[PDB]
Write a protein that binds this ligand. Structure first.
Ligand SMILES: Nc1nc2c(ncn2[C@H]2C[C@H](O)[C@@H](COP(=O)(O)OP(=O)(O)OP(=O)(O)O)O2)c(=O)[nH]1
Ligand SMILES: [Mn+2]
Ligand SMILES: [Mn+2]
Length: 175
DNA sequence: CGTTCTATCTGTACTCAC
DNA sequence: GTGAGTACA
DNA sequence: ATAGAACG
């Protein structure tokens, strides 16, 4: 069911202090600095088809556990699909049902994953096609050339975009 | 030779063979 | 266990 | 962003 930008932000704000995962007995809280709003919400589209959240996980050992044992305090939801990297929930928010999409990235993948999950799709396609012509492959995990991770000296998304030789635009204006 | 239109990526989760 | 086909991020 | 194709 479709939702407004404002509704999207209220939901994300509510989830931001309430996400956790079960890890061998212990309930472990997910920190706010590891929750990044992505998709059309980040791009500030007036109407959203869903809410898209990227979760930064500190260790590779945790991937088996975070999404598959995801917990949301005081909220009822069902699980449509769930793996280590993509989880789709249907959540009850103020008597209505909405789609929440959760994705995981490792610290070293962060800027690549924010770039990828921010979209929009058409932007990603043209950017990736251009890199492909110069014999590179870009995905949510990194920049690859001949199946080898290229070690870029970069922390943020903005640094990545510039490093790739493309114009930086705020998410609202990417196309 | 300029204008305008067109096309283009990459990977995850689930199901169902065999 | 692996590969193909679908749906969808 | 880039480059090819149709059109002028
Ligand atoms: N490379 C790539 N990335 C995608 C694709 N589909 C989705 N994504 C990424 C970029 C999107 O902004 C992000 C979320 O996808 P959604 O389908 O939720 O679309 P988005 O939120 O942009 O709009 P919407 O949900 O319809 O309001 O995931 C795809 O086909 N290819
Ligand atoms: Mn979305
Ligand atoms: Mn989504």
């Amino acid at each position: 069911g479709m939702l407004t930008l404002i509704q999207g932000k209220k939901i994300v704000n509510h989830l931001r202090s309430r996400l956790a995962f079960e890890y061998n007995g212990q309930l472990i809280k997910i920190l706010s600095k590891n929750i990044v709003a992505v998709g059309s919400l980040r791009r500030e589209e007036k109407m959203l088809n869903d809410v898209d959240l990227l979760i930064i996980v500190p260790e590779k050992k945790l991937l088996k556990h975070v999404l598959p044992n995801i917990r949301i305090k005081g909220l009822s939801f069902s699980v449509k699909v769930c793996g280590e990297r993509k989880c789709v929930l249907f959540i009850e928010w103020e008597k209505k049902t909405y789609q929440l999409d959760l994705f995981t990235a490792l610290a070293e993948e962060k800027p690549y994953a924010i770039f990828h999950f921010t979209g929009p799709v058409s932007y990603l396609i043209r950017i990736r096609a251009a890199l492909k012509k110069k014999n590179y492959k870009l995905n949510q995990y990194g920049l690859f050339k001949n199946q080898t991770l290229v070690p870029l000296k970069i922390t943020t998304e903005k640094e990545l975009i510039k490093e790739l030789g493309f114009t930086y635009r705020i998410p609202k204006k990417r196309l």
